[PDB]
From a paper:
The T3SS is a specialized apparatus employed by many Gram-negative bacteria and symbionts to inject effector proteins into host cells. The T3SS ATPase utilizes energy from ATP hydrolysis to separate chaperone proteins from effector proteins, unfold effector proteins and eventually force them through the central channel of the secretion apparatus. Using a crystallographic approach, in the present study we reveal atomic details for ATP binding by the highly conserved T3SS ATPase Spa47 from Shigella flexneri. The ATPase domain exhibits an α/β Rossmann fold comprising a twisted plane of nine parallel β-strands that is sandwiched by seven α-helices on both sides.
In ITC experiments, ATPγS exhibited similar binding affinity to Spa47 as did ATP, but AMPPNP bound poorly to Spa47, with ~15-fold lower affinity. We performed crystal soaking experiments to determine the crystal structures of Spa47Δ1-83-ATPγS and Spa47Δ1-83-AMPPNP. In stark contrast, we observed much less electron density for AMPPNP at the P-loop. Indeed, only the triphosphate moiety could be located in the electron density map, and electron density for the sugar and adenosine base was poor. In the final refined model, the occupancy for AMPPNP is < 1.0. However, neither the electron density nor the occupancy of AMPPNP could be improved, even in the presence of 85 mM AMPPNP. However, when ATPγS accommodates the active site of Spa47Δ1-83, all solvent molecules are expelled except the catalytic magnesium and one ordered water molecule. However, this was not the case in the Spa47Δ1-83-AMPPNP structure; the ATP-binding site remained occupied by a number of solvent molecules, resembling the situation in the unliganded structure. Of these bonds, the hydrogen bond between NH of G162 and the oxygen between the β- and γ-phosphates of ATPγS (length = 2.5 Å, angle = 130.4°) plays a vital role in ATP recognition; when this oxygen was replaced by an NH group in AMPPNP, the hydrogen bond donated by G162 was not observed, and the loss of this hydrogen bond could explain the dramatic reduction in binding affinity for AMPPNP. By contrast, a similar movement of the side chains of F167 and F339 was not observed in the Spa47Δ1-83-AMPPNP structure, indicating that the base of AMPPNP did not fully occupy the ATP-binding pocket.
Author numbering: -3 to -1, 84 to 311, 313 to 380, 393 to 430
Amino acid sequence: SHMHTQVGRGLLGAVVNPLGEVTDKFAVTDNSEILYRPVDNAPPLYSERAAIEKPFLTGIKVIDSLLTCGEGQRMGIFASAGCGKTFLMNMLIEHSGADIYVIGLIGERGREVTETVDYLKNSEKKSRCVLVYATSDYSSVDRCNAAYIATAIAEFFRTEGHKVALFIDSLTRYARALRDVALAAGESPARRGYPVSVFDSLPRLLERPGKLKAGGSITAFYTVLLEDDDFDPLAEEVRSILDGHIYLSRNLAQKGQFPAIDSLKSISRVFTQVVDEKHRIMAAAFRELLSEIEELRTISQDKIYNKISVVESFLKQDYRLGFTYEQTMELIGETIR
Ligand SMILES: Nc1ncnc2c1ncn2[C@@H]1O[C@H](COP(=O)(O)OP(=O)(O)NP(=O)(O)O)[C@@H](O)[C@H]1O
Ligand SMILES: [Mg+2]
Ligand SMILES: [Mg+2]
Ligand SMILES: [Mg+2]
Ligand SMILES: [Mg+2]
Ligand SMILES: [Mg+2]
Ligand SMILES: [Mg+2]
Ligand SMILES: [Mg+2]
Ligand SMILES: [Mg+2]
Ligand SMILES: [Mg+2]
Ligand SMILES: [Mg+2]
Ligand SMILES: [Mg+2]
Ligand SMILES: [Mg+2]
Ligand SMILES: [Mg+2]
Ligand SMILES: [Mg+2]
Ligand SMILES: [Mg+2]
Ligand SMILES: [Mg+2]
């Protein structure tokens, strides 16, 4: 692919379609830097990467505490329908502290793209975001390119030295679109209706993020849309390529526990290397308390029972609230004492 796309501070505040034109704005920005960069870009050389050591603070208590992210990390978000994945995304943008946010919405309905644009228009981060989208009326090629364009905009901000958060919602529809392109090129379905080339191409896309020795980072969140145990190689491919997954539980969602993150089914694979030992001990104590609260949910013992409302109160977090690290750990501290 020879296609270049616009990059620069000029795009901050902009809503961009798969063809590169601006079709709405959620903020206007003084700078009008516009340059061009390729949408196909190799990931960094291993020699160019910095170790993930500094946390990417989300402002989300259950994550910052039990599933701490690292700057330069790739994190999966796995969710079935209506478990609040879009709100989680909005939260991760709002309550974090990145310099730049780049969002890529792939094959969503026009109503879904407008929720996000509506969200940005009302957010403090508006001056810091770029939104790229391909609504469901767009072709497979356009859905794919929307993901590349988004990544390429993040890449440019990273080379500038910035601390960038990339969001791709969803890889599921990205892979479906990539599949159709492959089928139309005459490729054969391998195992599930996907030709083998779409899974083979995934590492190249999903390894473009990361921390650079030279300065700057992309921390990336990729959503994977789950069916209710219906017929999911894509999820297991993504689980294996990223370094962590946040699982959204429908049980917790219907129950009202938002964000419906199931810590037992989630992991950050950089956890240990981005939090100190006091955090680790405190977090592991908290997980012990959790698994002890689940032993009760099978229907001293009464003491952990009284710890439930304070725990649930720790987990639950209205999408409009953000918590500092100190606030979150302060709260963890109280539930384990
Ligand atoms: N943290 C939260 N605080 C408050 N309300 C929440 C929260 N999370 C979810 N909700 C509620 O749940 C809905 C959020 O749905 P949404 O975030 O779009 O999930 P979704 O998985 O993206 N839906 P879909 O994309 O079509 O599968 C809203 O109608 C809210 O009322
Ligand atoms: Mg850029
Ligand atoms: Mg453009
Ligand atoms: Mg280094
Ligand atoms: Mg955990
Ligand atoms: Mg939604
Ligand atoms: Mg969103
Ligand atoms: Mg819809
Ligand atoms: Mg169209
Ligand atoms: Mg098509
Ligand atoms: Mg095969
Ligand atoms: Mg890295
Ligand atoms: Mg890893
Ligand atoms: Mg939430
Ligand atoms: Mg609340
Ligand atoms: Mg608060
Ligand atoms: Mg903080």
